[PDB]
Amino acid sequence: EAPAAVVTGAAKRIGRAIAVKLHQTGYRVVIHYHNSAEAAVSLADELNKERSNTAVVCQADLTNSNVLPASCEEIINSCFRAFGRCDVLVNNASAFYPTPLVQKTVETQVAELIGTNAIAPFLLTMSFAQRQSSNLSIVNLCDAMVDQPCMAFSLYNMGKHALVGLTQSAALELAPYGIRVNGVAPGVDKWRRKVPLGRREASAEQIADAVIFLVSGSAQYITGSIIKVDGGLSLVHA
Amino acid sequence: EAPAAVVTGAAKRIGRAIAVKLHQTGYRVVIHYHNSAEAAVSLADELNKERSNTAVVCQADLTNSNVLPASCEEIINSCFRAFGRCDVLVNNASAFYPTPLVGKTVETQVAELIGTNAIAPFLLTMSFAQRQSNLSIVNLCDAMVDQPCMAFSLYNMGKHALVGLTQSAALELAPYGIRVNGVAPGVSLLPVAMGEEEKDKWRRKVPLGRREASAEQIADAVIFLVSGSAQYITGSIIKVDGGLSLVHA
Amino acid sequence: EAPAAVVTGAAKRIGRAIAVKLHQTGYRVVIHYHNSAEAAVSLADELNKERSNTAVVCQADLTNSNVLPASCEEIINSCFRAFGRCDVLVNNASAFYPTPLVGKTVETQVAELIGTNAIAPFLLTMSFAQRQSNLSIVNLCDAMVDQPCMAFSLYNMGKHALVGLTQSAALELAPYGIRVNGVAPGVSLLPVAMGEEEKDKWRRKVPLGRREASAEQIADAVIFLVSGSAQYITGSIIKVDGGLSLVHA
Amino acid sequence: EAPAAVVTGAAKRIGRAIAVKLHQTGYRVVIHYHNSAEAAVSLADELNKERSNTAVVCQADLTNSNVLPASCEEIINSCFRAFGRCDVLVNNASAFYPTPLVKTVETQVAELIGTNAIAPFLLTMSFAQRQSNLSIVNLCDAMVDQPCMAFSLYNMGKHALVGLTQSAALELAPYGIRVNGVAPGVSLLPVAMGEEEKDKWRRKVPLGRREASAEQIADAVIFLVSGSAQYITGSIIKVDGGLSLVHA
Numbered sequence: 001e002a003p004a005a006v007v008t009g010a011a012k013r014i015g016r017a018i019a020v021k022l023h024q025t026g027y028r029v030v031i032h033y034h035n036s037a038e039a040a041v042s043l044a045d046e047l048n049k050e051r052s053n054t055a056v057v058c059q060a061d062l063t064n065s066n067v068l069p070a071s072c073e074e075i076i077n078s079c080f081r082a083f084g085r086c087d088v089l090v091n092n093a094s095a096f097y098p099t100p101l102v103q104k105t106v107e108t109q110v111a112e113l114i115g116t117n118a119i120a121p122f123l124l125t126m127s128f129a130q131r132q133s134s135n136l137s138i139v140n141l142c143d144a145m146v147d148q149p150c151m152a153f154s155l156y157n158m159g160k161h162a163l164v165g166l167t168q169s170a171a172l173e174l175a176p177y178g179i180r181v182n183g184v185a186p187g188v189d190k191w192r193r194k195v196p197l198g199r200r201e202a203s204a205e206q207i208a209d210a211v212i213f214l215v216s217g218s219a220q221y222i223t224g225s226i227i228k229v230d231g232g233l234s235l236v237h238a
Numbered sequence: 239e240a241p242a243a244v245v246t247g248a249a250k251r252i253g254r255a256i257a258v259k260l261h262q263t264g265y266r267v268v269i270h271y272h273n274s275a276e277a278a279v280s281l282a283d284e285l286n287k288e289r290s291n292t293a294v295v296c297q298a299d300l301t302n303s304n305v306l307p308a309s310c311e312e313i314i315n316s317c318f319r320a321f322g323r324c325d326v327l328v329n330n331a332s333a334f335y336p337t338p339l340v341g342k343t344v345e346t347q348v349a350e351l352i353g354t355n356a357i358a359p360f361l362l363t364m365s366f367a368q369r370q371s372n373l374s375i376v377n378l379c380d381a382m383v384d385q386p387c388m389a390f391s392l393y394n395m396g397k398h399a400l401v402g403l404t405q406s407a408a409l410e411l412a413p414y415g416i417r418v419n420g421v422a423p424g425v426s427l428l429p430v431a432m433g434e435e436e437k438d439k440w441r442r443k444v445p446l447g448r449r450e451a452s453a454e455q456i457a458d459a460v461i462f463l464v465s466g467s468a469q470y471i472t473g474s475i476i477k478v479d480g481g482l483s484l485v486h487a
Numbered sequence: 488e489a490p491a492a493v494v495t496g497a498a499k500r501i502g503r504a505i506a507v508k509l510h511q512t513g514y515r516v517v518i519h520y521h522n523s524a525e526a527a528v529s530l531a532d533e534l535n536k537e538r539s540n541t542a543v544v545c546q547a548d549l550t551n552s553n554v555l556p557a558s559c560e561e562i563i564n565s566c567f568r569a570f571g572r573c574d575v576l577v578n579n580a581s582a583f584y585p586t587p588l589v590g591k592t593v594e595t596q597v598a599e600l601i602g603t604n605a606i607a608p609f610l611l612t613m614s615f616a617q618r619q620s621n622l623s624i625v626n627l628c629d630a631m632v633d634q635p636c637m638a639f640s641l642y643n644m645g646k647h648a649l650v651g652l653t654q655s656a657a658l659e660l661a662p663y664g665i666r667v668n669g670v671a672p673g674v675s676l677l678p679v680a681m682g683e684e685e686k687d688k689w690r691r692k693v694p695l696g697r698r699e700a701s702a703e704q705i706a707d708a709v710i711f712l713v714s715g716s717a718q719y720i721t722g723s724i725i726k727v728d729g730g731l732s733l734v735h736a
Numbered sequence: 737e738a739p740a741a742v743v744t745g746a747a748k749r750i751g752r753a754i755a756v757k758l759h760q761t762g763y764r765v766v767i768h769y770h771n772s773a774e775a776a777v778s779l780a781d782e783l784n785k786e787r788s789n790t791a792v793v794c795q796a797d798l799t800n801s802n803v804l805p806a807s808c809e810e811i812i813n814s815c816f817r818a819f820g821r822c823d824v825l826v827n828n829a830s831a832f833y834p835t836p837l838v839k840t841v842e843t844q845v846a847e848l849i850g851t852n853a854i855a856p857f858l859l860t861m862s863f864a865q866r867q868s869n870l871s872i873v874n875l876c877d878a879m880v881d882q883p884c885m886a887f888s889l890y891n892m893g894k895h896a897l898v899g900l901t902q903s904a905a906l907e908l909a910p911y912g913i914r915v916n917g918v919a920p921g922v923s924l925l926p927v928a929m930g931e932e933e934k935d936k937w938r939r940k941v942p943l944g945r946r947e948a949s950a951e952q953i954a955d956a957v958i959f960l961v962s963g964s965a966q967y968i969t970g971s972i973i974k975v976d977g978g979l980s981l982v983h984a
């Protein structure tokens with residue numbers, strides 16, 4: 001049978017491009033969404049028109065709460081139910097906004113910027129591992145600018161740092177199960193002009209290309225690695 | 239007057255050593271504690287006998303919850319209430335225990351490991367900054383964050399997040415003259431419940447002396463970062479690890 | 488026409504697997520070698536049997552000296568002479584041996600370890616850029632550069648310098664459309680001289696499979712970085728280490 | 737009785753401030769210089785006025801060559817001949833200039849890689865072979881991962897010095913020799929540089945919109961060689977005002 005992948009936040013932008021490329025490579029896909037139901041179904045419709053019953057949607061709020069563990073279990077379960085297997089988890093969903101240190105409640109901001117960006121990936125990783133010839137792997141969507149962060153983005157940056165720690169800890173702990181764990185770290189008119197490879201427009205498809213590599217048989221010895229896909233931006237001094 | 243410092247988890251071990259060395263340097267100190275009330279009061283008693291009215295205690299749970307922002311605000315408020323100023327914040331308190339991927343509910347583990355290690359330092363940083371000389375924050379990091387112990391993912395995530403806070407807060411608070419740095423132990427004071435044979439296994443890994451860091455050695459790096467000799471240093475994390483992090487598998 | 492690639496130290500082991508995979512992908516190849524003439528010519532013959540006029544050899548010593556720039560210029564020139572273009576440079580050649588701090592002279596060890604691992608890649612990069620589609624350079628780095636082998640200081644210095652070159656050249660060559668990236672093996676093909684018991688010692692450290700990387704697995708990451716699927720990737724170093732660099736002492 | 741230190745490139749700027757602070761802390765000092773003889777001698781004379789027979793100068797070119805190992809051995813030897821001991825080595829001397837990809841190139845290699853990396857390696861070898869609170873401090877660069885355009889050889893040399901710091905920390909730890917680094921961002925700016933250009937760099941620094949003084953860099957060196965750092969080895973302390981944290 002065809003392998004199957006879960007992509008979180010898959011309705012639009014980067015998650016959509018990732019789901020499309022996995023599907024094109026022969027994966028069946030779970031398109032996770034929170035609010036973007038119309039877009040998720042529209043994508044599933046397009047993929048199913050290409051190959052019948054190869055795409056399903058799954059609703060879950062990835063905010064941290066007492067029910068986040070159940071929601072993450074359901075995302076993984078939905079893959080097994082539709083397809084009988086779950087070979088690939090892509091932790092792509094993320095919240096992004098500033099949280100200034102000097103002036104949503106702050107604990108709501110914690111729930112979104114830490115919950116969605118780090119805790120949901122952790123819980124999804126647990127559920128994925130617990131439910132397990134094969135080529136099993138997880139890819140976490142990191143941030144190339146994690147060590148040169150945007151001003152007043154402390155909670156966002158903390159969450160993306162935690163995600164690096166998860167990538168490394170899970171790579172170590174899941175290696176005995178043959179589960180590889182890796183990351184892809186994107187960068188980004190003012191910003192475009194900073195990018196060394198700025199002649200090329202940045203695209204969601206370029207991010208997806210790195211995800212496709214990492215889940216492929218061409219990356220079977222790669223675990224705990226984070227691939228920057230940033231056009232050189234992180235190399236540029238102030 | 240004398241400057242004042244908040245040290246979290248200061249009743250015992252590394253936090254106590256930091257509080258003691260800050261006090262010896264001339265600081266008035268808030269000794270934060272959670273469960274170790276007898277030890278915290280005993281320490282404050284010793285310090286106050288040395289110089290009267292220079293130490294207070296402050297109890298707070300630093301587990302994440304909807305009241306954590308108020309608890310962190312209160313810790314900073316206690317320093318201003320006792321001493322009329324708050325010059326230094328040391329984020330030392332930490333929960334440390336395994337959370338295998340394959341007692342406590344997972345959401346409790348998240349609240350404790352991510353709350354103590356990262357969210358509380360964030361909220362304390364917010365409160366410290368908002369309440370405002372040589373002002374600085376020192377975060378107790380971990381030199382082994384990139385070579386983590388097996389089955390400690392939540393602990394490791396929290397310490398990674400603490401590196402992110404150190405860097406983000408250094409950037410953002412620099413215009414206010416608040417420096418933000420870290421001290422990253424490798425192996426220092428081993429868990430009390432750890433057997434000696436297991437302690438020795440870890441000691442033997444350390445290139446510089448085949449021994450763990452003393453609490454004083456960790457405190458020495460904190461003292462440097464808060465001192466005038468570190469006035470241009472912000473966003474730096476000083477490993478105090480005897481070379482441990484350089485040793486391959 | 489078909490694009491062309493220079494692979495240094497391509498007669499044997501990882502460089503050979505890289506040359507083969509680039510050839511299989513459609514590249515014409517310059518097989519650079521130093522001492523392994525029989526192996527280099529044998530490889531070129533095998534590749535030419537597959538597609539005529541798609542492989543040549545080029546001999547050069549990559550030890551540092553006042554003639555190293557001419558040797559590196561010649562390697563790039565050989566690709567233009569054979570194929571009329573040079574699209575890819577893979578800096579794979581390496582000297583590897585201990586140089587303790589406490590029968591070669593020290594300046595020979597410097598010339599060999601720093602020359603082959605760092606200076607030659609720099610000069611080859613200069614020549615490649617000056618002679619100039621999907622142009623790129625791939626440097627063979629080392630996943631263990633921050634947890635080095637005992638008594639390998641010069642080797643480790645050379646590999647650190649190669650990280651610096653990768654980043655500096657990525658920055659400087661980006662406006663010419665030349666990407667510069669690295670592939671960092673952990674334990675891959677072990678030294679020929681090594682005993683089986685010692686080889687197994689190292690194999691057992693690797694989390695993913697308890698085995699070293701095959702040459703083919705290292706080559707796979709090089710193939711990705713030179714491909715159209717990596718056109719926004721520059722200044723990146725991909726570890727291909729089975730998790731080895733994540734394992735504490 | 738009093739410990740002794742070698743400081744390379746100690747005649748001016750950062751190395752001068754390091755030599756002064758070490759001397760103030762109680763060290764006897766070898767002031768290494770290459771071209772700056774008058775400044776080296778003036779510093780030695782000032783230090784000897786403070787305490788007799790506590791400073792000497794030592795001339796050497798630290799460019800890579802067949803004679804570099806002997807030169808580096810002689811620098812370390814000069815400390816033992818003057819003071820009977822050598823407790824601290826500070827690798828401060830540096831060549832710094834652009835080397836665009838697109839002086840001969842091999843001269844540039846010899847200068848940039850020799851001063852910044854090979855000379856520190858050879859001095860480390862000689863220091864260790866000759867051997868309490870022993871340590872080495874290497875002057876690194878906080879911007880090694882966000883380098884200036886067209887500075888590849890300089891950047892390669894400073895990356896190699898990070899590798900040396902870590903490899904030597906590991907290998908010399910059994911001998912009780914600690915090996916650490918101090919990594920400035922922008923400190924003392926080139927003397928010729930216009931104030932208007934200096935200001936473009938100063939404005940980038942989060943902490944105070946100014947460059948580090950030489951004394952602030954020296955303060956981190958003094959901490960690292962002190963009894964307060966006796967468990968610290970293989971560590972590189974940035975002294976950069978937050979500069980390395982600032983995105984493009």
Ligand SMILES: NC(=O)c1ccc[n+]([C@@H]2O[C@H](COP(=O)([O-])OP(=O)(O)OC[C@H]3O[C@@H](n4cnc5c(N)ncnc54)[C@H](OP(=O)(O)O)[C@@H]3O)[C@@H](O)[C@H]2O)c1
Nearest residue numbers: 247251252271272273274299300301330331332378425426
């Ligand atoms: N020890 C090492 O080898 C080592 C290695 C790497 C990093 N570090 C870091 O260095 C710092 C000091 O280490 P340590 O071994 O001295 O720390 P520790 O003894 O493990 O913990 C210090 C204090 O943290 C407080 N704490 C724990 N959970 C809390 C909660 N939910 N709310 C409020 N306070 C809480 C406790 O206070 P009460 O006792 O009052 O309840 C405890 O005494 C920590 O940040 C640690 O992560 C230590």
Ligand SMILES: NC(=O)c1ccc[n+]([C@@H]2O[C@H](COP(=O)([O-])OP(=O)(O)OC[C@H]3O[C@@H](n4cnc5c(N)ncnc54)[C@H](OP(=O)(O)O)[C@@H]3O)[C@@H](O)[C@H]2O)c1
Nearest residue numbers: 496500501520521522523548549550579580581627674675
């Ligand atoms: N193997 C591993 O486990 C491992 C681990 C980390 C990094 N790496 C890196 O990956 C790359 C390939 O590894 P490998 O084990 O296949 O390499 P290797 O066999 O050690 O060396 C590859 C080739 O480099 C050439 N070479 C050595 N000294 C030279 C000189 N002075 N001038 C010109 N060429 C010279 C040799 O060519 P001739 O035979 O023609 O003389 C040799 O065949 C290297 O850069 C290595 O540092 C490998």
Ligand SMILES: NC(=O)c1ccc[n+]([C@@H]2O[C@H](COP(=O)([O-])OP(=O)(O)OC[C@H]3O[C@@H](n4cnc5c(N)ncnc54)[C@H](OP(=O)(O)O)[C@@H]3O)[C@@H](O)[C@H]2O)c1
Nearest residue numbers: 745749750769770771772797798799828829830875922923
């Ligand atoms: N200044 C900064 O902003 C900055 C930033 C990042 C890193 N750093 C690092 O911090 C350290 C001190 O910086 P600095 O600006 O004070 O250094 P500097 O003035 O550029 O150089 C220090 C000394 O190095 C010596 N030197 C240069 N080439 C030499 C050679 N071939 N042989 C022997 N000695 C040689 C020179 O000695 P003579 O004058 O006697 O010839 C010079 O006075 C350096 O390692 C530098 O790379 C500085």
Ligand SMILES: O=c1c(O)c(-c2ccccc2O)oc2cc(O)cc(O)c12
Nearest residue numbers: 332334380424425426427428429432440
């Ligand atoms: O990080 C710790 C740690 O690695 C270790 C550690 C424990 C056993 C063996 C090696 C260790 O580094 O102990 C800790 C104890 C604490 O109270 C708090 C901590 O953060 C640590």
Ligand SMILES: O=c1c(O)c(-c2ccccc2O)oc2cc(O)cc(O)c12
Nearest residue numbers: 581583629636673674675676677678689
């Ligand atoms: O870096 C290498 C290495 O660590 C090792 C290595 C050797 C023994 C045990 C573990 C290792 O990673 O082998 C190499 C062999 C080479 O020909 C070239 C190299 O760069 C290495």
Ligand SMILES: O=c1c(O)c(-c2ccccc2O)oc2cc(O)cc(O)c12
Nearest residue numbers: 830831832877921922923924925926937
């Ligand atoms: O690294 C340096 C540097 O970045 C700079 C620098 C120069 C201009 C603008 C910004 C800088 O960081 O100056 C140096 C001067 C030296 O004498 C030696 C150095 O290593 C530097």
